[PDB]
Structures are given as C-alpha cells and as structure tokens.
Scaffold this active site. Structure first.
Site, mmCIF file in Angstrom:
data_model
loop_
_atom_site.group_PDB
_atom_site.id
_atom_site.type_symbol
_atom_site.label_atom_id
_atom_site.label_comp_id
_atom_site.label_asym_id
_atom_site.label_seq_id
_atom_site.Cartn_x
_atom_site.Cartn_y
_atom_site.Cartn_z
ATOM 1 N N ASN A 189 25.995 38.032 34.474
ATOM 2 C CA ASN A 189 25.125 39.097 34.818
ATOM 3 C C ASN A 189 24.393 39.983 34.056
ATOM 4 O O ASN A 189 23.830 41.465 35.140
ATOM 5 C CB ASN A 189 26.395 40.228 35.991
ATOM 6 N N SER A 193 30.420 36.463 39.270
ATOM 7 C CA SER A 193 31.674 36.453 39.608
ATOM 8 C C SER A 193 32.024 36.369 40.909
ATOM 9 O O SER A 193 33.238 35.359 40.997
ATOM 10 C CB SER A 193 32.247 37.866 39.260
ATOM 11 N N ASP A 237 42.440 35.547 35.456
ATOM 12 C CA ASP A 237 40.899 36.862 35.751
ATOM 13 C C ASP A 237 42.201 38.704 35.672
ATOM 14 O O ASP A 237 43.357 38.032 34.399
ATOM 15 C CB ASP A 237 40.630 36.656 37.083
ATOM 16 N N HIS A 247 39.531 43.084 40.892
ATOM 17 C CA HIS A 247 38.279 41.723 40.597
ATOM 18 C C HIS A 247 39.507 40.825 40.717
ATOM 19 O O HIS A 247 38.443 39.431 41.395
ATOM 20 C CB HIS A 247 37.742 41.917 39.547
#
Ligand SMILES: CSCC[C@H](NC(N)=O)C(=O)O
Length: 278
Positions: free
Chosen positions: A161, A224, A39, A69
């Site tokens: 998403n 996520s 990530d 994130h």
C-alpha cells in the site's frame, strides 16, 4: 445465482463492466474448498460465517481477533453476504497481534503451518491461502511463500500500500505466488496500490464492505482487501474444476477483464479478476 445489492467488489468480479450492483455466481459457491486466512485471526462466531469459520492456530496468548483486519479479509473470502465463495470453509491462522504487527519469523511459521495442516483438513476441491500482509523485502519470507504454493496451496498475497514498486516488498515480490493489486469502483488503480511487473492481477480494494469484530461490518481500503477477492475467486473456480491450486493464478489472469483499468503504470498488468459466470 444472483445476490442483489451486493458490495461493489463482488458485483465487479462478476461483471464485464463497472457500475453494477448484483453479484452473479454458480451456486456451488466454493463448496468443498478451504481458504486459510493468515492474519490477525477471525471472529468465527460472527453470524456471517454460519459455522464455516474456525481458528486453527495462533502464535499469541489468544486466538481472538482483537483487531478486525483478519475478520474483514475472511468475510470477503467467504461470508454469506460479503464473500466471494459463500460455501467455502475458512481457517484462521493468527500470525499478527491485535495491533496488526508480527515478526517475519512468526509469519514464516504460519505459512509452514498451513502447508502441513491442510493434510489434516477435508478440502477435496482444493486449498487456498490469503495473505493480506507484508513488509520490506526478505528472501526468507519469499521462500516460505514459495514453499506454501509448492505444497499445493493457491497463495494470494497483497501487493502492498505504498504506491511503489512491489519488487521491494515481501511476500509480494515472490514470483511463484499470486500478487494482487487494488482497484476502485470506477476502475482506477487505487491511489495507494503498489504496482510493477511482479503484480499478477488486480481486485477490488477501495471501500470494501465486509465483516468486522463485535458482530459488525465496516468498509475499509487496501491491497489487503483486494487479496481475499482473488483468494475467494480461486476457491470458487477450483470447486468448479476450472483450475487447480498450481494453475489458478495463471487461469485468473488468462480469464480476467483486460485493459479496463486506468492509472496503471507502463509495465504493470492491466488485468481485473473476473469469474466469467454471466
Ligand atoms: C446493502 S450493502 C451494498 C453495499 C454497496 N454496494 C454497491 N454496489 O455499491 C457498497 O459496496 O458500498
């Protein structure tokens, strides 16, 4: 063990019903397992990680998470308060820059890195990788995810998403890894969650409280956020000896809460990750 007033997602993965707030889990808590969070990085100094998080690779000028994130995802895997597997070891691999962006070649390199680096780490109970990222279909990205799984790592990936069929996204569309959709606290498919026959499981993804950079916390939404619930659950179940990296996705689906979710398109699994503890 029981954690009162837990984030709703932790309570949900330990319950047969929505609307409870305690997280119940075996005290082994993923001890002896390892989870790679691929990530934007992890703020390993966050008190919530208790020394159990470590950056191991970056492809940029720094290994710092300048975005948040990756730190949030790592917190859902294994932070003391916000994490599924409260005793797991967390390894950060920074394939995304501080704007959340990364080339597919860099993402592939990071997956290959984990497949080898796990041989330099002590993870006797098993190894998991959480990939809360993706983009348009790429056979090369899917192949990298398949290689990582094949090497003996439980790979959990976000479905995406776009409220669309995840067959058009990568690594979501790779059949051999565990593709994770998102649900909300009322047991509805999250409005943004991708769907489709490639999905293997849903986890909590709307309004997930976890760690953030600067030693803070916040609530955000996405597939996520659902992915690290499944990755942490895999580490927890592997520590208990219930399953292995090769079989953990199938085991989670076999033991999931079935038929509890609404707004699931015909042809998408109606399965919500569940730890079966009590
Ligand atoms: C003291 S933190 C509790 C956070 C809150 N928990 C639940 N169960 O709603 C939430 O998920 O928003």
């Amino acid at each position: 063990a029981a954690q009162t007033n837990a984030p709703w997602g932790l309570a949900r993965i330990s319950s047969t019903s929505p609307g409870t707030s305690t997280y119940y889990y075996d005290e082994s808590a993923g001890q002896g397992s390892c989870v790679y969070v691929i990530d934007t990085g992890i703020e390993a100094s966050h008190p919530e990680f208790e020394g159990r998080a470590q950056m191991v690779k970056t492809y940029y000028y720094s290994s710092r998470d300048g975005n948040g994130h990756g730190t949030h995802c790592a917190g859902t895997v294994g932070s003391r308060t916000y994490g599924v597997a409260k005793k797991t070891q967390l390894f950060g691999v920074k394939v995304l820059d501080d704007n959340g962006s990364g080339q597919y070649s860099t993402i592939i390199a990071g997956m290959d890195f984990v497949a080898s680096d796990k041989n330099n780490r002590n993870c006797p109970k098993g190894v998991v990788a959480s990939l809360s990222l993706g983009g348009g279909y790429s056979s090369s990205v899917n192949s990298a995810a398949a290689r990582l799984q094949s090497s003996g790592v439980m790979v959990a990936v976000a479905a995406g998403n776009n409220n669309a069929d995840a067959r058009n996204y990568s690594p979501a569309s790779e059949p051999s890894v565990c593709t994770v959709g998102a649900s909300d606290r009322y047991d509805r498919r999250s409005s943004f969650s991708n769907y489709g026959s490639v999905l293997d499981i849903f986890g909590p993804g709307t309004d997930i409280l976890s760690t953030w950079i600067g030693g803070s916390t916040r609530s955000i939404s996405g597939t996520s956020m659902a992915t690290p619930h499944v990755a942490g659950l895999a580490a927890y179940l592997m520590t208990l000896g219930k399953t292995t990296a090769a079989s953990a996705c199938r085991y989670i689906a076999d033991t999931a809460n079935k038929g509890d979710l609404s707004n699931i398109p015909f042809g998408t699994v109606n399965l919500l990750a569940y730890n079966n503890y009590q």
